[PDB]
Design a binder for this molecule. Structure first.
Ligand SMILES: Nc1ncnc2c1ncn2[C@@H]1O[C@H](COP(=O)(O)OP(=O)(O)O)[C@@H](O)[C@H]1O
Ligand code: ALF
Ligand SMILES: [Mg+2]
Ligand SMILES: [Zn+2]
Lengths: 180, 662
């Protein structure tokens, strides 16, 4: 029922090929992204060195659903000032700086990263996930759908810039959106 | 700060006052500190009573010598005593007896002591007071520890004959898993524990029974995770029809499918039979198909490239040896092989096709390191040395590994006939680098499953390994870190997970049984122990007479023949030995028979067939080629039987040494 109460602020999304990483691949009318060992040629400018992609949409409320192939992936949203280069051997940036909010899912437990800080959250079994963002209250929350609706965690902040979803992926991991 | 944790002092209580006994605590609970503390008390008390007291520490793997030397003994006794760390690699400049006569705490490998004890001037066991024996579960049928303890036991029984004496030094031995000798009975398990105890001449196992929870807090059970996989690629089947054509040419019945251990065993034994017959046109074919088989086995284990390189190297040198004589079934092989191999190199070079196991390995490595975020040390345990080295190359090549910050190196023991032998100094610095942390992933073999104390090991990984129970308990122990993860990787094709299952149940048997013996009645304990002591001695004597009678020899009776050809090589009187070590022939016409070849400081001998015979060596200013008994065939003169031997010790012949007057 709550999902029904949500979907009037549901928003559809699609990626940006420029920001896609080298080994990454876009498909299904730019609504599905897949990771492959083989490179899609050189990366070039406008592409995130680390394994992240951002969608064409940003928000100057909003809800959307996401389905994922398997765990060991990260979903989040950042300011448009997210770094694109690389400085650390680890291949994820989101949540390291205060300009982004992150949530990484693993087979064991959940971790929500921001300003380089994260806490352990009890793990989940399903892969389809949902999330709410309210600009008026400056509140970002994460939900799980299968089998039931779990209000996983809420983030409080004040935003002075539009927010763009950014997704961190692993090899042999595929990520897909939803639309209605 | 030699302040023990409570349980440590608790289990050390019987040890403080004589009572040569054993201590077993679960892995990662610092037994070495117990050894150090006990040693300090022993030496200090003996000094207070003013008697010559010493202690020797025995370890069974070289790497641990330096580890235990500079990590637990140096830092705690730099002011109190003279501790010296000695191993078979360090260039001594002074005899062993004086080494012991100078210092008082020795850290050495057991083989050194046993060498020094069978030299009857040498040394006597009585010269020592305390014998620390680390990882003494290896005390078994004719192992290095068993010999030493059998001398000790023999003296003890002599003392009992005297009573109805000479002091026998106090004994300590450290274990983590005594294990069972493959026993599906409760009786055989508890028996096995008793056999170990008696062979150690212990008094009481003395394992913790008081401070349980704090122990549960110190040690951590790692999380177990299973990676099991089970892609079609013609390369396997491409080798298949090539080799089936090869087998069908000589129309051999396999009696089993290809690529299996029984097939390899059958291939070797039938190749031996063919060489016994003198059957050419078959022998060579048998060896070559064998080579294909081992190539396939490596092929399933590791990537395609190295497996192809192995075969290509063999055939390259094969034709290289063949063309030397220039200066029918033979060519029958290379003709088809070379077209096929060109195609294979074309097929092998394609990296899209990949082994199933390696795939899951890549998944595991990436998942674990990325989840850890730059705080992760991982140890991968393998089986064969070249597996370790090739996996290192596989790490090196694909740049996707390095981006995650994994820094990998391969660690193996010293000593073959392959890429390159790594030497002791190199591995010593390798472990040094690993402790620092700019070598992030370590690929190891059997050498380092017992004793490594790296404080940060989040990841311990087993790659298609099958083994007994101790070699699994210790492997899980290596992850001496919090949230430690133990991952088993294999494919369901072989008996791997089932080996894991039976190993698990066997482990539980062992714990319950040691609890059983833990609670026996002292007099019955003594009777059973004594009886076992006897048993070992009488059986050793019986084996002694069996061996000495088995040894039974004309040095001229036999003559040697090629295997590839059968041309007579030389007779018995032509062979002489250097320092009881190396057989060799001086005969000048025999010098004319063979061919030298170089790729060199030493030359390799080549027959007329092209088969190798021996290697050139220079000794005491003489130039002289040697021979390997594997390369030849023995022929007697009383019975015309065609026999072979892999090594020289089997042959009952005795040779004269070297007239050097020539
Ligand atoms: N009293 C103690 N205080 C702190 N650490 C200890 C103590 N006793 C043992 N340890 C730990 O034990 C480790 C040494 O273990 P070691 O004996 O090499 O393993 P094992 O007992 O499996 O051979 C040290 O790194 C140390 O951290
Ligand atoms: F318990 Al240990 F080396 F003595 F792991
Ligand atoms: Mg140890
Ligand atoms: Zn020959």
């Amino acid at each position: 029922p709550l999902r029904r109460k949500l979907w009037q602020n549901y928003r559809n999304l699609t990626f940006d090929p420029v920001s896609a990483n080298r080994h990454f691949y876009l498909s299904r009318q730019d609504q599905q992204v897949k990771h492959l060992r083989q490179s899609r040629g050189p990366g070039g400018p406008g592409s995130f060195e680390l394994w992240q992609v951002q969608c064409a949409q940003s928000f100057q409320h909003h809800y959307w659903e996401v389905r994922a192939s398997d765990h060991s992936v990260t979903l989040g949203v950042s300011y448009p000032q997210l770094p694109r280069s690389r400085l650390g051997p680890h291949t994820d940036n989101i949540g390291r700086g205060p300009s982004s909010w992150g949530l990484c899912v693993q087979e064991d437990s959940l971790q929500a990263w921001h300003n380089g800080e994260a806490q352990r959250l009890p793990g989940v079994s399903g892969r389809l996930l949902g999330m709410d963002l309210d600009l008026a209250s400056g509140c970002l929350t994460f939900y799980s759908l299968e089998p039931q609706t779990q209000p996983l965690y809420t983030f409080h902040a004040l935003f002075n810039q539009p927010l763009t979803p950014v997704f961190w992926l692993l090899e042999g991991r595929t990520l897909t959106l939803c639309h209605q | 700060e030699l302040q023990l944790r409570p349980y440590q002092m608790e289990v050390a209580q019987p040890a403080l006052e004589g009572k040569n006994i054993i201590i077993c605590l679960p892995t990662g609970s610092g037994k070495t500190r117990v050894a150090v503390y006990i040693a300090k008390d022993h030496l200090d008390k003996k000094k207070k009573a003013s008697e010559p007291g010493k202690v020797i520490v025995l370890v069974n793997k070289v790497l641990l010598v330096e580890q235990l030397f500079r990590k637990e003994f140096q830092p705690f006794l730099k002011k109190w005593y003279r501790v010296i760390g000695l191993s078979g690699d360090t260039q001594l400049k002074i005899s062993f007896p004086e080494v012991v006569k100078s210092c008082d705490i020795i850290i050495s490998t057991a083989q050194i002591l046993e060498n020094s004890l069978l030299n009857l001037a040498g040394v006597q066991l009585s010269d020592f007071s305390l014998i620390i024996i680390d990882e003494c579960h290896h005390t078994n049928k004719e192992a290095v520890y068993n010999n030493i303890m059998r001398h000790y036991l023999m003296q003890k029984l002599k003392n009992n004959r005297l009573k109805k004496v000479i002091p026998l030094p106090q004994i300590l031995g450290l274990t983590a898993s005594p294990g069972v000798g493959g026993a599906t009975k409760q009786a055989k398990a508890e028996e096995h524990i008793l056999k170990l105890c008696a062979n150690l001449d212990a008094f009481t196992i003395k394992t913790v029974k008081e401070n349980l929870d704090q122990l549960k807090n110190q040690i951590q059970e790692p999380c177990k995770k299973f990676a099991i996989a089970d892609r079609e690629d013609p390369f396997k089947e491409k080798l298949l029809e090539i080799m089936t054509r090869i087998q069908t040419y000589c129309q051999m019945s396999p009696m089993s499918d290809f690529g299996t251990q029984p097939y390899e065993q059958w291939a070797i034994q039938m190749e031996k039979k063919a060489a016994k017959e003198g059957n050419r046109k078959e022998r060579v074919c048998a060896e070559h198909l064998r080579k294909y088989n081992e190539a396939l086995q490596i092929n399933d284990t590791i990537r395609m490239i190295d497996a192809y390189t192995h075969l290509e190297t063999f055939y390259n040198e094969e034709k290289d040896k063949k063309f030397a004589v220039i200066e029918e079934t033979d060519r029958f092989l290379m003709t088809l092989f070379f077209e096929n191999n060109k195609m294979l190199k074309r097929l092998a070079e394609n990296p899209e096709y990949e082994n199933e196991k390696l795939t899951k390995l890549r998944n595991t490595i990436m998942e674990q390191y990325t989840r850890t975020e730059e705080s992760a040390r991982g140890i991968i345990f393998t089986k064969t040395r070249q597996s370790a080295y090739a996996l290192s190359q596989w790490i090196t090549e694909n740049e996707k590994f390095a981006e995650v910050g994994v820094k990998a190196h391969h660690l193996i023991g010293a000593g073959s006939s392959e890429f390159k032998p790594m030497t002791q100094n190199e591995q010593k610095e390798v472990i040094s680098k690993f402790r620092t942390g700019k070598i992030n992933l370590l690929i190891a073999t059997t050498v380092a499953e017992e004793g490594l104390d790296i404080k940060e090991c989040n990841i311990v990984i087993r790659y298609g390994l099958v083994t007994n129970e101790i070699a699994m308990v210790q492997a899980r122990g290596r992850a001496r870190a919090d949230e430690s993860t133990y991952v088993l990787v294999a494919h369901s094709g072989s008996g791997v997970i089932e080996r894991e299952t039976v190993n698990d149940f066997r482990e539980k048997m062992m714990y319950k049984a040691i609890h059983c013996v833990q609670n026996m009645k002292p007099e019955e304990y003594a009777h059973k122990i004594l009886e076992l002591q006897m048993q070992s001695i009488m059986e050793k004597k019986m084996k002694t007479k069996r061996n000495i009678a088995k040894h039974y020899n004309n040095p001229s009776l036999i003559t040697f023949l090629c295997k590839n050809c059968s041309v007579l090589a030389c007779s018995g009187e032509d062979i002489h030995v250097i320092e009881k070590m190396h057989h060799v022939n001086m005969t000048p016409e025999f010098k004319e028979l063979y061919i030298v070849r170089e790729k060199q400081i030493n030359g390799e001998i080549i027959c007329k067939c092209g088969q190798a015979w021996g290697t050139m060596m220079v000794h005491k200013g003489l130039d002289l080629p040697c021979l390997k008994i594997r390369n030849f065939v023995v022929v007697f003169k009383n019975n015309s039987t065609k026999k072979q031997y892999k090594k020289w010790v089997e042959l009952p012949i005795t040779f004269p040494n070297l007239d050097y007057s020539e």
